[PDB]
Design a protein around this ligand. Sequence first.
Ligand code: SX7
Length: 263
Amino acid sequence: DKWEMERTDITMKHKLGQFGEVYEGVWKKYSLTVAVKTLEVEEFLKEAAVMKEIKHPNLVQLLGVCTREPPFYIITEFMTYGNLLDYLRECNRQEVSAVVLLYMATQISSAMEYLEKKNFIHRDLAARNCLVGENHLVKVADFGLSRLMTGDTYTAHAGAKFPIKWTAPESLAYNKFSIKSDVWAFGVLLWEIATYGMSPYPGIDPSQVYELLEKDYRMERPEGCPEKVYELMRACWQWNPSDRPSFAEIHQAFETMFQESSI
Ligand SMILES: CCn1nccc1-c1c[nH]c2ncc(-c3ccc(N)c(C(=O)N(C)C)c3)cc12
């Protein structure tokens, strides 16, 4: 297809390794700095297939694939400032102000509304899996997206391990994932943003989080976080998946807040 590329079109500059086999590269023809994911086989090739169907300003854009013979490449745009978590921790808070925080939440929710619309599920939404470009542009990392009709559920493989503090209670107890477990994770992401990259449930060991969530314990409102934003967080953390808002509802709320904060 139009996506298929020659391996020799790209030269690798620097290895980037929390994301795995991921490199900074050069698309020589365009003098363009790119990101390259290299390599099981069938899972990797499906990743590439799904990414061909993703087209949104706030999801990392696929540029090309090398899938004919090993070693296999997935080539995407390069996000200059790296992951959002480290970006928030290291930022100038006078530059990355409250309105900027709303702007980033609006961008992420836009991408998630798109996935909700297009029957995709993320399953690993967190600040570490969002990427930052110039001028506070934020894009959701989309290399591990899966096909799932919005409303349907996925049952994780036996012995699966999750990032507990981002993981919805139905996922923790029953290994069940849906768009609503993404909504839960987004709530935790909101908290990460509001705190400029604090670790969620600070001091609480992961193995004790589920029992607390049962008892209706939730994280308290972060310092300086608007009540409207915290109410959205808490709506995302509703015990019953069906009681949580949709990303369409969430995006509309943030877009309104961002427009009002600008005016
Ligand atoms: C498919 C390729 N891929 N797999 C995972 C992420 C990306 C990626 C795509 N586009 C990217 N654009 C930029 C970066 C990037 C750049 C600099 C950085 N310091 C970091 C960073 O946060 N650290 C801690 C290594 C991340 C990663 C990706």
